[PDB]
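Aim 2 progress. For Transcription elongation regulator 1, the working sequence is reproduced below.
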Amino acid sequence: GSSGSSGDREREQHKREEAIQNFKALLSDMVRSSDVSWSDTRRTLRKDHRWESGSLLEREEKEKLFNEHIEALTKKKRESGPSSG
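Predicted structure tokens for this construct:
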């Protein structure tokens, strides 16, 4: 079908989707490090502006995202404990 996307085919979900991606990006930008704890993070994000819209994601959802973002970062880190299977 037409490559270009247009129309109000998907608005409901879309609304949320935006929050999801936006949340992740905000985590990397704000929390670029991986040596931090959820508590501190959440509190910090709670002050951010975008966070407002992030409300969509339930406490659990948000917490999960952050954690995942951290573990992922370390992986990139050149020097890091022996992680294999």
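The chain has one domain: 1-85. This observation will guide construct design in the next reporting period.
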